[PDB]
Amino acid sequence: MALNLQDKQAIVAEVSEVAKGALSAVVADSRGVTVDKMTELRKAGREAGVYMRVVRNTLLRRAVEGTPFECLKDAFVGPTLIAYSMEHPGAAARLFKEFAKANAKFEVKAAAFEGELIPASQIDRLATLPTYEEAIARLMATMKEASA
């Protein structure tokens, strides 16, 4: 490994994603294959490319060293194996969705999805999301309200 001069970058970089981010998910990759990463990188791909991460770090000692910053709801995620996912642009989006759909294709556990932060809380798969731009679901709420 590297000394501190390097354990600091994995911090100053990874914590300015939290400081400058959008949504957060969860997942434990016990059996995390590489067809695994391959896929989810195309997903990050659709979800821009390299706007997304997953930098395995669940050393509390790392991606909690980014938490007493923001998201101290994660002192509780960080135990055991974890795969932290941050969003920069994009809706508070679909990121959420396929992690459940992925891991529900066996694709290993999902930490039961211990969940995360947009609010400041816990678990439950939501597509309360990428409807986003479904302001059309407030366009159809126009003419249909005007007519009916």
Binding site: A135, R138, T142, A146
Partner: peptide
């Protein structure tokens, strides 16, 4: 209110205008 006076603007408008707006149209009614 005037329905045409709220269609001419309600088909043509910006973006982030809406993004910090229709996370809340859901609130007054629904």
């Amino acid at each position: 209110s005037i329905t045409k006076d709220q269609i001419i603007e309600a088909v043509a408008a910006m973006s982030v205008m809406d993004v910090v707006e229709l996370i809340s149209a859901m609130e007054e009614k629904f």
